[model samples]
Target: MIEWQDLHHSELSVSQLYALLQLRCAVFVVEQNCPYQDIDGDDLTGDNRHILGWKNDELVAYARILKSDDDLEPVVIGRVIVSEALRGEKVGQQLMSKTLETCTHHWPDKPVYLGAQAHLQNFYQSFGFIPVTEVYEEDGPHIGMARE
Candidate 1:
């Protein structure tokens, strides 16, 4: 069975933190062929969260939850991904489900939002996220999404 964990920046051990970065680098950088700095220090910021999915000791999925100081803006969730090995297994669906549950529990008043890679825009809408915009960001078109 897979274990799902939601941790704050200060709560993660060095090994857990390292694994998170490694998996993200593997997918967002090496796999997608994008070269911008993935480590932009937001991972350690205040009230920020790291959502981790572990299959035994392996880091199989991950996402980040970001809270804003301004109460008017929506809570942001990004860096969503699953291990390349788990693609056909519906792990991505479980990952997003857990992420939304956590957001609802913690940030109940704020809408949840993400910047979806264009191709996954339709897939994201299955979760009830409406598109906010289609602005270009980091490699290609990104569909801004929000669940209110």
Candidate 2:
């Protein structure tokens, strides 16, 4: 089973912090061959929620939920990923489910949103997300999603 952690950036221990960024870099940077900065300064704010998934003492997947700006309304879930080995077994589902639960815990009944890769539109829709914008490009792929 995947364990979860809900905390601000300041609460993370060295191991937790290292594993979170390592997993993100493993999947989104090295594995995916994208060189963008993984540790952007956006997460320093207390409003960021860092979700980590661990199995057998190894960090395998992770994501961040940022308190949305007033213009966005719904909170935004980003950097959602699963290690390549865990993809077909619904780890993504567990991640998003925990994320939604975390939202309800912090800001009950508020909507949740994500810029899901277009290829995963149906995957996210299975969790109540709806298409809010036309397909748009990001990181060379199309993406869109909005949930309430």
Candidate 3:
């Protein structure tokens, strides 16, 4: 069974914190071969929340959501990843669905933004996100996407 948790930075236990960081670095750093800082220090904020997806107590997917006023975009979702074991199993779709629902619950009137990988623009668009910028490189090509 797949379970979801929307938790503030302070709400995560030590084990949960370790798992989250482990998975993030595993995919975002090692798997993608993007050698930059995975720990951006944003996760420590009270206004940030993590949307974690677990399968039988093991984390298989994750995303980070920022509260309105925390960033220029009002509410933002980033760091989306699905573990290698769960990729192509429709896990990304499920993760985004839950992330959007949680974002709407937290801020009903504001639009949410994401710096999406350029190739995934259509994927994000399926969730109502529209491109707001040209492609730019950050490890790889990315573009600004927003959903209201």
Sort every candidate by TM-score, greatest first. Answer: 1, 3, 2
What is the per-residue lDDT of model 1 for residues 50-131, given as tens digits with 9 covering 90 to 100?
9999998999999999987545788899999899888878898999989999899988988998988888888789987999
Of candidate 2, the 10-residue stretch with the lowest lDDT total is: 137-146
Q: List the residue pairs that clash in candidate 2.
A: none
Q: lDDT rank, highest first?
A: 1, 3, 2
Write out the backbone clash pairs for model 3.
none
lDDT of each: 0.90, 0.82, 0.88
lDDT of 1 at 68: 72
- Measured with C-alpha atoms, the lDDT of residue 108 in candidate 3 is 85
Q: How far is candidate 3 from the true structure (C-alpha RMSD, Å)?
A: 1.5
Tens digit of per-residue lDDT, candidate 3, span 35-139: 888888888875789989999989999999877455455688999998888788888999999999988987888888898898888999999999999889977
Candidate 2: residue 34 lDDT (0-100): 85
| lDDT, residue 18, candidate 3 | 96
Residue 11 in model 1: lDDT: 96
- lDDT for 135 (candidate 2): 81
CA RMSD per model (angstroms): 1.3, 1.7, 1.5
What TM-score quantifies how close candidate 1 is to the native fold?
0.94
